[PDB]
Amino acid sequence: SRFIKCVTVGDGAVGKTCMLISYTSNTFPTPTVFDNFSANVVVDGNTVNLGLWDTAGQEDYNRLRPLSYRGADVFILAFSLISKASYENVAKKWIPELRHYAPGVPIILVGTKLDLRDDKQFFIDHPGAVPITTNQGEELKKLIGSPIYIECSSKTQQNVKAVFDAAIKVVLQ
Amino acid sequence: RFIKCVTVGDGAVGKTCMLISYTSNTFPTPTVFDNFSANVVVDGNTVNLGLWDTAGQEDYNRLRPLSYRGADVFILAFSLISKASYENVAKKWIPELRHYAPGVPIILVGTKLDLRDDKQFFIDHPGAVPITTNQGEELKKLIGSPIYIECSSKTQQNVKAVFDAAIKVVLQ
Amino acid sequence: ADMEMMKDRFAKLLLGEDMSGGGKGVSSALALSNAITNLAASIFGEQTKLQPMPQDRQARWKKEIDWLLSVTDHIVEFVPSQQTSKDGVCTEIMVTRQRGDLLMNIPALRKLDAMLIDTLDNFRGHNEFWYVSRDSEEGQQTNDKWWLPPVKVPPGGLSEPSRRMLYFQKDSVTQVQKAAMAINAQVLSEMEIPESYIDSLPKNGRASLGDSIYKSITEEWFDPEQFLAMLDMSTEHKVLDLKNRIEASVVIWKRKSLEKRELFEERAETILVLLKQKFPGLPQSSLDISKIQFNKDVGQAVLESYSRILESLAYTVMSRIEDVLYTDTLALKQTLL
Amino acid sequence: DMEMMKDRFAKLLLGEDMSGGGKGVSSALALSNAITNLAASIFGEQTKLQPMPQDRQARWKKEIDWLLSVTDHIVEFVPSQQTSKDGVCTEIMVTRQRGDLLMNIPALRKLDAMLIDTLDNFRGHNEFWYVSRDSEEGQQARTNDKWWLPPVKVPPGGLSEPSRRMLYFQKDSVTQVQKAAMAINAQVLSEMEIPESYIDSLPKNGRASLGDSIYKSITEEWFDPEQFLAMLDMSTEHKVLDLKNRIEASVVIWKRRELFEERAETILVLLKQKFPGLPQSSLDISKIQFNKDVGQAVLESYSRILESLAYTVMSRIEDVLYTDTLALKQTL
Ligand SMILES: Nc1nc2c(ncn2[C@@H]2O[C@H](COP(=O)(O)OP(=O)(O)O)[C@@H](O)[C@H]2O)c(=O)[nH]1
Ligand SMILES: Nc1nc2c(ncn2[C@@H]2O[C@H](COP(=O)(O)OP(=O)(O)O)[C@@H](O)[C@H]2O)c(=O)[nH]1
């Protein structure tokens, strides 16, 4: 039995503390906390000790969580599908961070808030957001040279398990 | 350097109560003593003390399976107001220790010092006989152990001594 | 005062058990297992008579034990599952489940807890037997446990009804002891074998058992029944030593002429089964002690030690019933000569 | 609430391995992480200069008491004396809060409470105001790189020079609080134990960690740490940190002739001055990860989050201060 340390990184507001909470418990809130969580999972017969790590809040202070990158087996890199800014930052900001702190460690690319992305109403109502299309994700995924791109939504739970399965797959293989 | 100090003896002999008094300077007016460790300074070097209670292991042999494992020193307590606890030290305690934890050193302790020369107490409890500090010694020299101390949780007389003594036979 | 009280207990467990901060103490499991065993010891150490555990000690036992056991509510199996919405979209999820060995056992051990406590409640009110002050004249005139208060009985012995009542109660309680002990054994058997223990194991099965014992479990014939009848089982120490040499051997075998070691192992496990049958109340073996000393699973620590204290409480209560029953016998005899 | 404390402490005894097998982490690092995750969670919502909502303040108060409690019990076990009403001296062993926890815990709580208060000094009228990030007025308004925060605005054409006087008074009040916390954070990590893993990863000799160029410099006849540094590339934070890591490794080697060691230590000090906001070093990261001592765990972990709050708040003051500078500018 291996150990997988799986850190989720991304901008603020892109919603990970929710993806993590929802994967782990099948809920969706409203404070909002994901304490470090580890548990045994069986993948294809052999059993695996999976560790889930949130980075919420270190978008603000570089020294807040010194433990995020140390020995990480895989990243989940999330951007919000209703935010062109988080889309641009994957490239401009996150890839250099990971290239530096944990070189050669796999990245699962994930777009969040699937459920808002073709909500015509939501965008007239929040003029500043911009939907990212699945193509643009795919395109981005190739660009940063990550193995797989999943879109998901912690409100509906769509593809959430998919993501972590993919994080696990890539560490094992 | 680590010391595992278990203290054994009969029931009702004062034990769990010594311990509480060594460690917090209180009595009982439930008395519970949880497993305790603390760093101690002895002649400049620093030792890590481990205190173990046995209360129970006088109603069920199977209750405390970890009492004797790796023990570094025993405190073998008997109540100075109980001929039967005195008699028992030889009839029962030495044979245990000699089997489960051979060669591990034994500090002998008479507890309930405050009650021994108390004349009115024995009028009130005719079934009790006070043990003499001599009989204490005699027992000591007999059970083949290096140190005999008499103490009282109530007064707190000689309690620190008991442990300092326990610590010493391990360090030398 | 309670929220206050509880913090203290829990804080001391995170420390574990090293009050000097450095967490150079024991694992959480051990810290937990220890505090359960000490709690029980102090609470039941006053159960000195056949009577209702006092109302407020029933109360402290209940909540303290509750605090201690709660960790189990959070120990889980994390398994795949499925989930469908009001609209019909099936979505794949990870789901959470109390771990297998706590799902059934924890409720079962708690069920014994309450049966013991209420066995003791059936002694509310008049009892034909009474207890006397240990250092009184009455007391003076099993003298072994000198620290308990002596029972006395009517000069003519007990009455069929209060005697039938007591036997029925001895039987009830010894089944609870059998039960608890059975859980205690399951879990010990499902607990990791410590690197410490292996390191100290001899090279060969021959070395564990000894040449004589080896020759025995190794011949063409073998009836484990006669095997034991051939040995010296006279004292509890001798039986325990045999148990140890057997357990060690099985460990060696499981770890590793070729074919027939399956047999030896089959037999060795057969002889351990018999030992539980013939010698139901043996103390812990060496590999039991070690499993406990070095165990890191919070879940098993709670299971192992809870069952252990329950086993003990039950045994303590029969020990009382047997005390009256015995002096009642002395009452009949001394009333016949 | 007891129902809700129980959940908290119970998951710390698992630590954090949800599946029993305490294979898994230390009550220390369970603690450390939990303090971190709580603070992150709570101040993650301080997105504006205003009092922490009262319900939040309440929750932060209790859960932080919970996490901090273990320290009430960490002690020194020390011989002593006591004499009775009747006059008899008796030798006892006494108990006391372990050294670093006696002064620092109170000290850290007073900083916590000072942060909370500076935010209370925002209860009621503020000459500045926030617009939601996704609404039109937002899109017209340092900001573009944290797309998630609400854009602050200040009245067209400066803001009152009392309202700006005060904000400076608070940018400073808070910077001094930040520095205090960091100073405690610093202290603990230096009194933390050096991990066996870290030693193991260390090179053979001083000239391997510093390498031969830098080795010549801490090894010549003259030396003055000021010049030393003016001769190295310190353009980036990554570069300064690589040096810090090389100096630290050497020091640790030599404490297991002493001239170098003394100079090496002199250089680190100079770094901590010139480069105060520096991320933590390889050794600190490691001290933290393998640390078994819950006393220090709570100490370093707690000072760390306070460091961060103070920084969060002074960013929120710099946010307004500077969209103020922009207001005077676009008045041209
Ligand atoms: N509508 C919607 N909102 C989401 C979803 N996932 C997260 N959010 C929102 O994301 C906001 C903050 O996300 P959060 O979980 O805190 O991510 P984080 O702050 O980066 O850790 C919250 O207001 C959530 O409502 C989703 O699937 N759908
Ligand atoms: N006078 C006096 N009474 C004591 C002393 N120690 C214990 N006792 C009383 O004697 C009994 C001691 O029992 P305890 O402390 O529980 O020892 P244990 O049962 O063997 O663990 C209790 O009732 C105490 O109140 C002592 O040093 N002096």
* Integer Cα distance of C14 and C31 in angstroms: 8
End-to-end CA distance of chain C: 60
Q: Which of C7, C31, C74 sits opposite D66 (nearest CB)?
A: C7
C-alpha triplet C221, C227, C232: angle, nearest 5°: 155
D188: left (phi over 0), alpha (psi -120 to 50) or beta: alpha
Angle among Cα A108, A109, A112 to the nearest 5 degrees reads 125
Contact in structure between D105 and D71 (CB atoms under 8 Å)? yes
Q: Which residues of C27-36 are buried (b: 16+ CB within 10 A; e: fewer)?
A: bbbbbbbbbb
The whole-angstrom separation of Cα B51 and Cα B4 is 7
CATH number of C1-191+295-337: 1.20.58.2010
Going by C-alpha positions, the residue among B30, B19, B68, B6 that lies closest to residue C41 is: B30
**Which chain C residues are within 8 Å of B60, Cβ to Cβ?**
311-312, 315-316
Q: Which DSSP state fits D5?
A: H
Is residue D50 helix, strand or coil? Answer: coil
What ligand 1 atom has the least distance to the C-alpha of A152?
27
3-state SS class at B100? helix
- Is residue A86 lining ligand 1, measured as CB closer than 6 Å? no
Alpha-carbon gap, residue C138 to B127, rounded angstroms: 10
B109 token code pair: 């302790």
Amino acid at D272: K
Residues 6+ apart with CB under 8 A from D114: D173, D177
Q: Is the distance from CB of A9 to CB of A94 less than 8 angstroms?
A: yes
Nearest to D19 by CA among C153, A41, B91: A41
Instruction: Specify the residue for token string 């209860």.
Output: D123
CA nearest ligand 2 atom 28, residue: B112
Strand partners, B73: B5
CB proximity list for C260: less than 8 A, separation 6 or greater: none
Is residue C244 within 8 Å of C218, Cβ to Cβ?
A: no
Q: What is the resolution of this structure in A?
A: 3.1
Question: In this structure, which CATH number among 1.10.730.10, 1.20.58.1310, 3.40.50.300, 3.30.930.10 belongs to the domain C192-294?
Answer: 1.20.58.1310
By three-state DSSP, how is residue D272 classified?
A: helix
Beta bridge partners of D130: D152
Closest listed ligand to the CA of A9: 1
Q: Which helix (H) or strand (E) holds B74?
A: strand B73-79
- φ, ψ dihedrals at D83, nearest 5°: -125, 150
Relative to the CA of B115, which ligand 2 atom is closest? 1
| Structural domains of chain A, count | 1
One-letter identity of residue C315: Y
Lookup: tokens for D274:
């010139």
CATH topology of C1-191+295-337 equal to that of C192-294? yes
Residues of B in contact with C137 (CB under 8 A): 126-127
Query: What is the phi-psi region of residue B144: left when phi exceeds 0, alpha when psi lies from -120 to 50, beta otherwise?
Result: left
> What HEC string does chain C produce?
CHHHHHHHHHHHHHHCCECCCCCCCCCHHHHHHHHHHHHHHHHHCCCCCCCCCCHHHHHHHHHHHHHHHHHHHHCEEEEEEEEECCCCCEEEEEEEEECHHHHCHHHHHHHHHHHHHHHHHCCCCCCCCEECCCCCHHHHCCCCCCCCCCEECCCCCCCHHHHHHHHHHHHHHHHHHHHHHHHHHHHHHCCCCCHHHHHCCCCCHHHHHCHHHHHHCCCCCCCHHHHHHCCCCCCHHHHHHHHHHHHHHHHHHHHCCCCCHHHHHHHHHHHHHHHHHHCCCCCCCHHHHHHHHHCCCHHHHHHHHHHHHHHHHHHHHHHHHHHHHHHHHHHHHHCCC
* Architecture (CATH level 2) of domain D1-192+291-332: Up-down Bundle (1.20)
Is beta strand A46-53 parallel, antiparallel or unpaired with respect to A3-10? parallel
CA distances to A40, C188, D16, D286 from D24, in Å: 11, 21, 6, 17
Beta carbons of C23 and D26 less than 8 Å apart: yes
User: Which of D11, D133, D134 is the mutation pick for testing A, counting most A CBs within 10 A?
Assistant: D134
d(CA C249, CA C241): 13
Longest dimension (CA), chain C: 88
Q: Is the peptide bond before B150 cis (omega within 30 degrees of 0)?
A: no
Instruction: Report how far residue D49's alpha carbon sits from residue B59's, in angstroms, rounded to the nearest whole number.
Output: 65
| Residue contact D40–A65, C-beta within 8 A | yes
Are C83 and A157 in contact by the 8 Å Cβ rule? The answer is yes
User: Is the CB of residue A56 below 6 angstroms from any atom belonging to ligand 1?
Assistant: yes
Instruction: Kindly provide the b/e burial profile for residues D68-92, where b requires at least 16 CB atoms within 10 angstroms of the residue's own CB.
Output: bbbbebbbbbeeeeeeeeeeeebeb
| Ligand 2 centroid distance, CA of B15 (Å) | 7
Which domain range does residue B143 map to?
A: 1-172
Say if CB B120 and CB B111 are below 8 A apart.
no
- Asked whether C316 and C43 are in contact (CB, 8 A), the reply is no
Q: Do C71 and D10 touch (CB under 8 A)?
A: yes
User: Which token pair is C38?
Assistant: 């000490």
Any chain B CB within 8 A of the CB of C34? yes
Residues paired with D148 in a beta bridge: none
Question: Measuring CA to CA, which residue among D21, D28, D22 is closest to residue D195?
Answer: D28
Tokens encoding C108 = 């079962």
Residues shown for chain D: 332
Residue D250 backbone phi and psi in degrees, to 5: -55, -60
Contact D94 B23 (CB under 8 A): no
> What dihedral angle (degrees, nearest 10) is formed by the CA atoms of D310, D315, D321, D325?
150
Give contacts of A161 with chain C, Cβ < 8 Å: 80, 92-94
Write B40-49 long-range contacts (CB < 8 A, 24+).
Answer: B40/B167, B40/D77, B41/D78, B42/B167, B42/B171, B45/B1, B47/B1, B47/B2, B47/B3, B47/B167, B47/B171, B48/B1, B48/B2, B48/B3, B48/C18, B48/C20, B48/C24, B49/B3, B49/B5, B49/B163, B49/B167, B49/D77
Which method resolved this structure? X-ray
* Residue written as token pair 């089964």: C273
Closest CA to C17 of B18, B49, B127, A167: B49
State the alpha helices, DSSP H only, in D94-160. Answer: 99-120, 136-139
Domain ranges in chain D are: 1-192+291-332, 193-290
Q: Is D91 on the interface with B (CB under 8 A)?
A: yes
Other Cβ atoms less than 10 A from the Cβ of A64: the count is: 24
Q: Is B touching A (3+ C-beta pairs, cut-off 8 A)?
A: no
Rounded CA-CA distance B29/D106 in Å is 33
Q: Which residues of B23-46 are buried (b: 16+ CB within 10 A; e: fewer)?
A: bebeeeeebbbbbbbbbbebeeee
Residue A6, beta-bridge partner list: A52, A74
Judge whether A93 is annotated as a binding position.
no
Token pair for D217: 């410099």
Closest approach of chain A CAs to the CA of C81, in angstroms?
A: 10
Distance of residue C148 Cα from the nearest chain A Cα, in angstroms: 49
Residue of A13, A40, A64 lying closest to D19 (CB–CB): A40
Closest CA to A112 of A5, A17, A30: A17
CB C17 within 8 A of CB C72: no
Q: What sign for the dihedral angle of Cα D94, D95, D101, D102?
A: negative
Superfamily of structural domain D193-290: PRONE domain, subdomain 2 (1.20.58.1310)
B121, closest residue in chain C (CA to CA):
C135
Q: Which ligand gives the minimal distance to the CA of A155?
A: 1
Strand-pair partners of B4: B50
Q: What is the CATH number of the domain that holds A118?
A: 3.40.50.300
Q: Of A75, A63, A100, nearest to A7 (Cα)?
A: A75
**Residue B121 CA: which ligand is closest?**
2
**CB-nearest partner of D75 from B38, B157, B159:** B38
